[PDB]
Amino acid sequence: ESAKHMFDRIGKDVYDKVKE
Known part of the structure; x- marks a missing residue:
């Protein structure tokens, strides 16, 4: 669902976008 x-x-x- 939403929380997954x-x-x-x-x-x-x-x-x-962090590991890049």
Whole structure:
């Protein structure tokens, strides 16, 4: 759901833009 779609994105969004 929402807390496993926003947290799923956040986990590899400002983690993917962080590791770059």
